[PDB]
Design a protein around this nucleic acid. Structure first.
Lengths: 155, 52, 76, 73, 105, 15, 50
RNA sequence: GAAGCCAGAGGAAACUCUGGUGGAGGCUCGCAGCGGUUCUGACGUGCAAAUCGAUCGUCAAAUCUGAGCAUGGGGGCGAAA
RNA sequence: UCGUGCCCCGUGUGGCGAAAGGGAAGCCGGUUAAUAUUCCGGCACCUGGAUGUGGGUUUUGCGCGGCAACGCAACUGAACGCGGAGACGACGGCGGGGGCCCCGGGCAGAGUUCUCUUUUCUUCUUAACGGUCUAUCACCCUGGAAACAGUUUGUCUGGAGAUAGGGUUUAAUGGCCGGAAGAGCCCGACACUUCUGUCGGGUCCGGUGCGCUCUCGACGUCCCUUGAAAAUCCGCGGGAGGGAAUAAUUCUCACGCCAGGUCGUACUCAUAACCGCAGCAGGUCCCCAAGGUGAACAGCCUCUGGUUGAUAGAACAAUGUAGAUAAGGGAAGUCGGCAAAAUAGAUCCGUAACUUCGGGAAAAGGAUUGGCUCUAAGGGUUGGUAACAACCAACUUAGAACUGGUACGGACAGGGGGAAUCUGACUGUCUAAUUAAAACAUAGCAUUGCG
């Protein structure tokens, strides 16, 4: 009783690997008499041939590890294998900061809080690395507006 | 294929919609001639081709 | 495949000589009905909302153009 | 359970043994003969061409090794 | 507010007195958890019995039929009927308990 | 366009 | 290869038709000296040399 | 971390300094690939008429590589043994 | 009638040569024991040839509109010319799109269930071909800008016309629609000696990104290196001819008719289908490339998919091969520290002589690294001191307390370092099968011959 052909045909019919095909060991004679794909489909319908479910692979532990690192665990100096630039590129950080600062300057110019000359000056300062972040840029804008208002009041 | 369809028409009064051809591994040629829907391949094989 | 958005254009396509078959697809989950006519080059379809205009158009097709409602399962 | 190397076959794909079901329900204490599992438990040219196809698949048409001699001796 | 009806029909094992409907209702009462910790049935979740081995659950929150099937399988595992009883969604929001297929021997 | 297609058109006219 | 010339395929066709043992009625002829096919070829024994 | 570029502090200017940006180099560590330094290495009628293990050189190029073609022995080809 | 004659152009006049170059056109589902982008079903496309209908143009003969970029279903075009496509390097970052990976909810199914786990896992798909609305660059109109402005991660653009406002367009693997749910997939209930199936339900809605892969686009760098050709196709210049109302039409518009020949197509592509004398641990050109740890297609473990094949059983002597440990001393061993051990990731402090000023340099020498609970910082969208509200989002960085300890880059992974001398400038190359080197080559230098 050889069922290599039957296992290959059942794998082709069920659309799975040959390691996922289950042949009923109590009807090996009936499976042997099944010699075509139609007979294989009839045995699948009758339940003599079953596709086994997939071997278990869970991502649970990866999910609690992701949540723990999101909270801030497993981030110490003994958990790092790459350089600081390798984990987080400072060029990428500078690109994100420049895009944030330019977006804020464009929004302020569109809203009308600053004019074109102050916009150009702050654009070149942000390019020349005067501002670390958006809060610093907003504080400098407010301080420049306040000193301009003081100069206008003096004049 | 053009010669094959003429040969079939002259021999068995067979009209074919299309003909596929292959060359077998032993060196001969095998031809699959698909008939018109108005004729029956079972009837033709039973009467003329003798293939029962 | 082509979609026609005009009833009279679908009627003229049905009166065209090349039209060999017409069929009706009823979608109840969407509430629509599709009239599909098979010409030589293109399959022309008209989409309608479910109404009595579908049966009026069914009457409006020529009787020589044979029409079928599609089954639930496309058995061979 | 052997979930490390393989998945468990679903229970709906395996027929349950009658005596094993009766035994488990008998440990559970229900009156099996009273509740009745016995009834619930389960146990022409076309013809000529079909015969020709069956014969063609079963027996080879010719035997070039042994078609030259006919007597059994 | 939205209202959801779930039916758990154990008519055949209840008539066979294999599955205890009152014990299953109790199991639902101290196993259904609302807002992350148990004992929040309140007015949101209502479990009652009609008869003929049927339990109805009224849900005003997003209580799922998958969760009710999960709790039914947990109760079957507790009462050692997991290998012999099966929960099948025969209809929309209706889960039937039934025997697995049996062969004579 | 191409000479073959133009020849086809003028042959259609000639026929 | 799968890509093959018609001449090559014709010669492999002749090789396939030549790959056979002798008929058994050859051995019972009177004065027969042939006992086996002495030019039999196998795909893993000797090459066709094409 | 080279040119180029931005900002700030000076300097009459030229330029000086600082912080950035940038991403060059027959640059470098190193995986594949390519090669073949060392071992009282394995093997020595071997798996092998040159193989196997660890280790080592190189790795953005004078890098590796296929197919088609060219050069044919008193010849070719040779970063030259 | 034509097979006979008359002209016109004449500079030029062959073939072979790539299953990885250029190139006309096919996708999906199903089917066999073995073939399938080839068979079957559905739905298309290309080329060549004829030939009608509808529509278009025309008595202002060979269209109309928009200032323009240009648009529209058509919208004459011979000789002779012009142009484009074919048709093109390597590398670097950035942006868009498809696919893959990750997260959440919902339906159905499966598993776990001592306890816990509203739980973990699986299906949730949409091809070619078309319609329609959009998509960087670029171009057009108004206007004339220094108190220079716009703007990229990267400094370019602008009186040779910027910002701004309004548009036109190359480009889809983008949204919707047709194809097309009737398919495929998942689940359930009956029938079922076979023959064989039959009937229901669903196939949904979101998010995220220095992620992987492919492709497209705008940039930038390098060259004493500038990174194929031809077949084929198209537009233009030109105006030769042909052209209307017994209607005409030489319309690149839509629909309609016919045909598409020959040859290959199985299988392996390798620890058994090739070569090596073999079913030989060797050699042999490519495409796809999941999850976790981690900087990482490193090493280790797992999913899909494949194997469990390489003579077996018993015992544990010497000597071996491979892997290890060893008190005290620490090279006393040996020709010779051969071999092994020792160092190693990341953060921080710090780093000498010499030097062609570029390096040396990871010089050297030191301080730290687990787990848990927290804090702080770094953002996006929408909405008239908005310096405010609402909603949403993921990864880094710093600081603090507590706590286990023999050890915290807990396995894996992974520089020993320094003082000198000779030597070749360096990167590179060679004696396939005993020598990789002060050998060869190299840049630089010099000389010679030749108008």
């Amino acid at each position: 009783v050889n069922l290599r052909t039957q296992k290959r045909l059942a794998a082709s019919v069920l659309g799975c690997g040959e390691g996922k095909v289950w042949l009923d060991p109590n009807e090996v004679s009936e499976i042997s008499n099944a010699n075509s794909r139609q007979s294989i489909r009839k045995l699948v319908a009758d339940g003599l041939i079953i596709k086994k479910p997939v071997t278990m692979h869970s991502r649970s532990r990866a999910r609690e590890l992701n949540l723990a690192r999101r909270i801030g665990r497993h981030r110490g100096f003994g958990k790092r294998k790459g350089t600081a630039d390798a984990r987080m590129p400072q060029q990428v950080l500078w690109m994100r900061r420049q895009r944030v600062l330019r977006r804020l300057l464009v929004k302020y110019r569109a809203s009308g809080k600053i004019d074109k000359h102050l916009y150009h000056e702050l654009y070149h300062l942000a390019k020349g690395n005067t501002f670390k972040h958006k809060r610093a840029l907003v504080e400098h804008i407010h301080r420049a507006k306040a000193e301009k208002a003081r100069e206008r009041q003096i004049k | 294929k053009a010669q094959i369809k003429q040969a079939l028409k002259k021999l068995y009064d067979i009209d074919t919609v299309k003909i596929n051809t292959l060359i077998r591994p032993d060196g001969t040629k095998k031809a699959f001639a698909r008939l018109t829907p108005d004729v029956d391949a079972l009837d033709i094989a039973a009467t003329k081709l003798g293939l029962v | 495949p082509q979609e026609v958005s005009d009833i009279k254009k679908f009627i003229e396509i049905c009166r065209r000589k090349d039209a060999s078959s017409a069929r009706i697809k009823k979608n109840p989950k969407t509430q629509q009905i599709k009239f599909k006519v098979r010409c030589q080059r293109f399959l022309y379809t008209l989409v309608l909302k479910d109404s009595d205009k579908a049966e009026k158009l069914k009457q409006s097709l020529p009787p020589n153009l044979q029409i079928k409602d599609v089954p639930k399962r496309n058995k061979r | 359970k052997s979930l490390k190397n393989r998945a468990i076959i679903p229970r709906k794909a395996v027929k349950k043994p009658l005596s094993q079901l009766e035994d488990h329900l008998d440990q559970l204490g229900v009156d099996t003969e009273a509740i009745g599992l016995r009834a619930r438990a389960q146990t022409s040219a076309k013809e000529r061409l079909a015969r020709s196809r069956s014969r063609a698949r079963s027996v080879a048409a010719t035997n070039r090794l042994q078609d030259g001699v006919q007597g059994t001796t | 507010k939205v209202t959801k009806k779930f039916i758990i029909n154990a008519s055949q094992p209840a008539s066979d007195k294999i599955f205890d409907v009152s014990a299953f209702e109790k199991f639902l009462n101290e196993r259904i958890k609302v807002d992350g910790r148990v004992g929040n049935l309140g007015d949101v979740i209502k479990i009652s019995q009609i008869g003929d081995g049927k339990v109805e659950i009224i849900a005003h929150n997003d209580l799922s039929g998958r969760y009710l099937k999960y709790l039914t399988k947990k109760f079957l595992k507790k009462m050692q009927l997991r290998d012999w009883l099966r929960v099948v969604a025969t209809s929309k929001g209706v889960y039937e308990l039934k025997f697995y297929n049996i062969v004579n021997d | 366009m191409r000479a073959k297609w133009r020849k086809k058109r003028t042959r259609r006219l000639k026929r | 290869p799968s890509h093959k010339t018609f001449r090559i395929k014709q010669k492999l066709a002749k090789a396939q038709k030549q790959n056979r043992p002798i008929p058994q009625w050859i051995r019972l002829r009177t004065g027969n000296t042939i006992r086996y096919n002495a030019k039999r070829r196998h795909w893993r024994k000797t090459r066709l040399g094409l």
